[PDB]
Amino acid sequence: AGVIQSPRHEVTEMGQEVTLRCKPISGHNSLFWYRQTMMRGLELLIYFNNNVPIDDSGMPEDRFSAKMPNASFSTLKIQPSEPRDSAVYFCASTWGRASTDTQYFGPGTRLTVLEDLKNVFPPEVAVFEPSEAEISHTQKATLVCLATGFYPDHVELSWWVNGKEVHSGVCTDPQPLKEQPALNDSRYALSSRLRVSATFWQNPRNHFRCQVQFYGLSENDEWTQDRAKPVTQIVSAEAWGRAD
Amino acid sequence: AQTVTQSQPEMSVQEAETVTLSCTYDTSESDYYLFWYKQPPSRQMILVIRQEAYKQQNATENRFSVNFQKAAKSFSLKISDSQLGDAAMYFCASSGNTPLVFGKGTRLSVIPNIQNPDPAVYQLRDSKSSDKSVCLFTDFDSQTNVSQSKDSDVYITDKCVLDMRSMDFKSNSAVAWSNKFACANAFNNSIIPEDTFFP
């Protein structure tokens, strides 16, 4: 349908070669590569038209190369990668008949290049059942989820009520917290809330699950530590309804 | 000479009230386009509005409207009857020698109107433990400043507004936890409403 980017998340060690791939919209002829951070904003890197580069002045002097082998595929290689490469990389495409054509944006790839993988941890997920004072006082029931101790910040939290994903009545922190607020290595914590009516929580036939998708190491990566290798995984916590 | 300046980097608006997001530009080519892009927390870029240089200033009563001052090279974005779904980052963009030049953005936050505030600090307990605890500050008014922690071992999240999507209900919520700590003392560095409920 829209502009496709692969991968979506990437967590890798420095020195590795990072390959980002984009597929423009069918029929589109210009393709743009952007970068986003908080300090520099939306930064044009390079953009093509009919598979020919038009402006690559935004490309760094070293380690960044991009090419478009055919009309529906472009790549952007970072070799070798560095920690400062960590950003959200966007690919956009237009019809390519005018410089003023509307740009459609893909979902973007969040790339985190680490110094080393010694500090990577998956999250621990705990669900906290609604206060009975809150049920008594407001006739509503708030569930709280805590995803704690993960690094880096590549987590996606989601609530699943009765096997199906819900979005209403759910507020999760826009930004996580540093457990050690004075460390570059510091692992993160993240909280969520799912508030339902007292009637819905007190039905023991309702199933609540807090799901946290973590993005970490891959198959190619290696592990020289006697703790569980922090691969990409999904850590869940769940609770059943309680009438009393 | 293709610039886009969004000087106010953060903006707030009361729910259902009107906010104007500023943008000024400089260009060289007299044939340019102007854009507004919305970026929700998903990081997806969605085009809000799009204007052409040598066309009129619209006589449009849509919820998302534009104020185009070509002589002043200004390009406001007006949002009427603001909703909580409007809370996102907004980028003003130019289209000249470079097809798209972005401004540095404006984080717009939409304050929910809480008309039935029931400030309370509750204690929840773990489904599989019920010995590791959390404290939930909830249902306070939207002007309440809940601030971060001071202890190195107590963690306080900022407030979060949820929309139950039924009964037009909204509620603010902040979480605090610490393995050490009691709920009656968790948010006492934030100015708590006088009528806050401690069961």
Author numbering:
A (entry chain B): 2 to 245
B (entry chain A): 2 to 181, 184 to 202
Publication text:
Here, we studied an HLA-A2–restricted spike protein epitope (RLQ) that elicits CD8+ T cell responses in COVID-19 convalescent patients characterized by highly diverse TCRs. TCR RLQ7, like TCR RLQ3, was isolated by screening CD8+ T cells from COVID-19 CPs with RLQ–HLA-A2 tetramers. To explain the ability of RLQ7, but not RLQ3, to tolerate the T1006I mutation, we determined structures of RLQ7 bound to RLQ–HLA-A2 and T1006I–HLA-A2. These complexes show that there are multiple structural solutions to recognizing RLQ and thereby generating a clonally diverse T cell response to this epitope that assures protection against viral escape and T cell clonal loss.
To assess ligand-induced conformational changes in TCR RLQ7, we determined its structure in unbound form to 2.80 Å resolution. Superposition of the VαVβ domains of free RLQ7 onto those in complex with RLQ–HLA-A2 revealed structural differences in CDR1α and in Vα residues 57 to 62. The CDR1α loop underwent small yet relevant movements (rmsd in α-carbon positions of 1.7 Å for residues 27–30) that enable CDR1α to engage the RLQ peptide via two direct and three water-mediated hydrogen bonds and 10 van der Waals contacts. CDR1α Glu29 showed the largest individual displacement (2.3 Å in its α-carbon position). Vα residues 57 to 62, which are distant from the TCR–pMHC interface, were in unambiguous electron density in both free and bound RLQ7. The 57–62 loop adopts markedly different main-chain conformations in the two structures, with rmsd in α-carbon positions of 4.7 Å. Vα Glu61 showed the largest individual displacement (7.9 Å in its α-carbon position).
